[PDB]
Amino acid sequence: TYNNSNPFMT
Amino acid sequence: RPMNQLYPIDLLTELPPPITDLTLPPPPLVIPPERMLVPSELSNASPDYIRSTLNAVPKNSSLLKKSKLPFGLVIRPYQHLYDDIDPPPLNEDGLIVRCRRCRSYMNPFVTFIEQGRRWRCNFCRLANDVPMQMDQPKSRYDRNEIKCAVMEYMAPKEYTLRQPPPATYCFLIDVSQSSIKSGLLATTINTLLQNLDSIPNHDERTRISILCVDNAIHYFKIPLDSENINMMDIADLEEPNSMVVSLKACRQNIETLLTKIPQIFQSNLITNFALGPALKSAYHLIGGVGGKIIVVSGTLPNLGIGKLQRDSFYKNFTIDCSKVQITVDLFLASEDYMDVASLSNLSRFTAGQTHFYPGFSGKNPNDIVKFSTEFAKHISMDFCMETVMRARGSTGLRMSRFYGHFFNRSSDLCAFSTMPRDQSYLFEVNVDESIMADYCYVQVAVLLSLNNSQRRIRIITLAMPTTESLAEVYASADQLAIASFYNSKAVEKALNSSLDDARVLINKSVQDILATYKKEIVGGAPLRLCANLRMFPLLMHSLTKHMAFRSGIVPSDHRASALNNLESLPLKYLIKNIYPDVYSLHDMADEAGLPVGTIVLPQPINATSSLFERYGLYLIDNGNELFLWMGGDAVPALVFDVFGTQDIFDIPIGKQEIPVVENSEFNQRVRNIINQLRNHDDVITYQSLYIVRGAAREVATLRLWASSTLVEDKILNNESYREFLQIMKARISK
Ligand SMILES: [Zn+2]
Numbered sequence A: 001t002y003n004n005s006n007p008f009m010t
Numbered sequence B: 001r002p003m004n005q006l007y008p009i010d011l012l013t014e015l016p017p018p019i020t021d022l023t024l025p026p027p028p029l030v031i032p033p034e035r036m037l038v039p040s041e042l043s044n045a046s047p048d049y050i051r052s053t054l055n056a057v058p059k060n061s062s063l064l065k066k067s068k069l070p071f072g073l074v075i076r077p078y079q080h081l082y083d084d085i086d087p088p089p090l091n092e093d094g095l096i097v098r099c100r101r102c103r104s105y106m107n108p109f110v111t112f113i114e115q116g117r118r119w120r121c122n123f124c125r126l127a128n129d130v131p132m133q134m135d136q137p138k139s140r141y142d143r144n145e146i147k148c149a150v151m152e153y154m155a156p157k158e159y160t161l162r163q164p165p166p167a168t169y170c171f172l173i174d175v176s177q178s179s180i181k182s183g184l185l186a187t188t189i190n191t192l193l194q195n196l197d198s199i200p201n202h203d204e205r206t207r208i209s210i211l212c213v214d215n216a217i218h219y220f221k222i223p224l225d226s227e228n229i230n231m232m233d234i235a236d237l238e239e240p241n242s243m244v245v246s247l248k249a250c251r252q253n254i255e256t257l258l259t260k261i262p263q264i265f266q267s268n269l270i271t272n273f274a275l276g277p278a279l280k281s282a283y284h285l286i287g288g289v290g291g292k293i294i295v296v297s298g299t300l301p302n303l304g305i306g307k308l309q310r311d312s313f314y315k316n317f318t319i320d321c322s323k324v325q326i327t328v329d330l331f332l333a334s335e336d337y338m339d340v341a342s343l344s345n346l347s348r349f350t351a352g353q354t355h356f357y358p359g360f361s362g363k364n365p366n367d368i369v370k371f372s373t374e375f376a377k378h379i380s381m382d383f384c385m386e387t388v389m390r391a392r393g394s395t396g397l398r399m400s401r402f403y404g405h406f407f408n409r410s411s412d413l414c415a416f417s418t419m420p421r422d423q424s425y426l427f428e429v430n431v432d433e434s435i436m437a438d439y440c441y442v443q444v445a446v447l448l449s450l451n452n453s454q455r456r457i458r459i460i461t462l463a464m465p466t467t468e469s470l471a472e473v474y475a476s477a478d479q480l481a482i483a484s485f486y487n488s489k490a491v492e493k494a495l496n497s498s499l500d501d502a503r504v505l506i507n508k509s510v511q512d513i514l515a516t517y518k519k520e521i522v523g524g525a526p527l528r529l530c531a532n533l534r535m536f537p538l539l540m541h542s543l544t545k546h547m548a549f550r551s552g553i554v555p556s557d558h559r560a561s562a563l564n565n566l567e568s569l570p571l572k573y574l575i576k577n578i579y580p581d582v583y584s585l586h587d588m589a590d591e592a593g594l595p596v597g598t599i600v601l602p603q604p605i606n607a608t609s610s611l612f613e614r615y616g617l618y619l620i621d622n623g624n625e626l627f628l629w630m631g632g633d634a635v636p637a638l639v640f641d642v643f644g645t646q647d648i649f650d651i652p653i654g655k656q657e658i659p660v661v662e663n664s665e666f667n668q669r670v671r672n673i674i675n676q677l678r679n680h681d682d683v684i685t686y687q688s689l690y691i692v693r694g695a696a697r698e699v700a701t702l703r704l705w706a707s708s709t710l711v712e713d714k715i716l717n718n719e720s721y722r723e724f725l726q727i728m729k730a731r732i733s734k
Helices: B019-023 B061-067 B177-184 B185-194 B251-264 B276-285 B315-320 B342-347 B365-380 B470-475 B479-496 B498-521 B534-542 B558-567 B571-578 B636-643 B665-677 B695-710 B722-731
Strands: B008-010 B050-052 B070-076 B112-113 B118-120 B127-128 B150-154 B169-174 B210-213 B217-221 B230-232 B291-297 B326-334 B354-358 B384-393 B396-401 B414-416 B423-429 B438-448 B453-467 B528-530 B581-584 B617-621 B627-631 B690-695
Touching: B019 B326, B019 B396, B019 B571, B050 B438, B050 B453, B050 B479, B061 B070, B061 B177, B061 B470, B070 B438, B070 B479, B112 B291, B112 B423, B169 B177, B169 B185, B169 B276, B169 B571, B177 B185, B177 B210, B177 B326, B185 B251, B185 B291, B185 B365, B210 B251, B210 B276, B217 B276, B276 B326, B291 B365, B315 B326, B315 B342, B326 B342, B326 B365, B342 B354, B342 B498, B342 B558, B354 B365, B354 B558, B354 B627, B384 B396, B384 B423, B396 B479, B423 B479, B470 B722, B479 B534, B479 B558, B498 B534, B534 B722, B617 B665, B627 B636, B627 B665, B627 B695, B636 B665, B690 B695
Parallel strands: B169 B210, B169 B291, B291 B326, B326 B354, B627 B690
Antiparallel strands: B008 B528, B050 B070, B070 B423, B112 B118, B118 B127, B150 B453, B210 B217, B217 B230, B384 B414, B384 B438, B396 B423, B438 B453, B581 B617, B617 B627
């Protein structure tokens, strides 16, 4: 899991 | 009697949905003045403290089962982050009149019999003797317990075993390399630094402690300021005074310490974070009195017991916490996998909370603002300790299930090692024996130890009329409470079965009600329902599209996070998290954006892309973030008023704030609205802003995210709300 504020980030 | 009336509607005739309903109060609680000792609005429980899914209770099981509506209670003991805000009345004479058998507290619904020498318990009908003390210039009717549904008492000695504890805090901070580089440590330290006086210390007894953790557990001995650093490292992960100290007597020293920490681990190259060991350390550090262990981390536990990979130890830890009244809060901020699904069980079963900061990075000034604002408000929030909560029902009613963050095993008692202010809870009620009275009652009691060394008992008494009319049951149904009920059942279904099963449960809740209404109650082919349940279909449908239940792909941590939030959110914020408030700013009324220091907000538009003009400006608020959507065809004048430039492709993109554009009253209004939507005295949430431009890759990704918020629209393979209704109609047909 690479986290990004945007859940739709590739 | 004025039993709420059924107001039939056709769901197909109300599209777009009249979303203004999301803000209307629930159906009235029809209680004639005679049933209340001292009639007033304060004589029955306010929807803010308790909301029954049913305000007209089925007089018997078979009827409850036939309604297909659930029987649950949305309970929220506290309304704000600070107890000084609108507190309920507080008794102090120490007199607590309680029934001998059921133990329910004196309330506005008891009946005084025999010249007022005895009272008949409204929960169990038992005759009780009225203490001569109830009449010592005021009479018994001047008393809160008889005047108010929601009130509080100062508990006598017998409601305490040990002396009220001090508010104890233990900050367990991740000082590993990920933390250093990301700035989480810096941000965490600076925030503590800027809020030591924000931490509640109503009795001057508040105690704090700091544990820094990497591969070993670093302690600190803090001397009294008056007697003016001692870092005690411990690498043996198999293994009080001056460790847990007075925030007041050591004020300068704690400050001196927090200032050095950043330098101490400045060049740390260790990538180990031994949460397990540290956690057990904190446990023994404060276990003798109880308190909060607030964990701040940006690194997956990877050393010592409880390590995780890409565990049941935590559940066992929570079991032990329930023995020494310890609550655990978690602030997880990292770009790497954190396993919110596992770690969130720590908070979940200790009445604490978990806050997740996806992709956190000091490199983004705005990341700091969000983390800091929330962490600060959170540590400043008042709370109770050694608290227990239960709900007693009148004959025939029984509490069967308990939802929310707290500890509960085989009882009807919910243990809160500490009870926060920002969460909500839900109790499912069962009607076993047939009720005989025209009214049934529910009383929630909270035996607590406030963070001011005081022992109190908060009471919430609710009275609901009974009925045998299925029509009357439906007319008094609280749609938002029901939505919440199924929201919790869905979280349970997911967290223990499957996401799909949870979707199935959500859609079914809607079909059963629509099917029941159609067959149990008597044009062309409408989709019938009543006015008070008009938003229900829309809420459940929209729920199925929430990041917590969506079908398809959603990162593990995000999902767990969404589930954790939906399950503890206060009703008000729950409804908005499911269905968002959308504001059309370009054609905003002139009042909007200006003071009435509270700003006026435009009226919300339906959450659908159908209303997004390509030249418009929209603001979406889903309770988690704020999206400023500017149509790719916005006139230069609008692009100007908002960002200063006239080139719409020059606008700021992503997580960024709106610039202060001088001499643009419009820019000020937009900033006012945003700031207004950002202040709440009941939750800690700080909503980051995302600026999105309508129609390089990041831009597409944002449009995608913002778009997903318009839950009325079709997404991939999830139909639109309009189609949803059509599908349902086809299903309940022969
Ligand atoms: Zn009783």
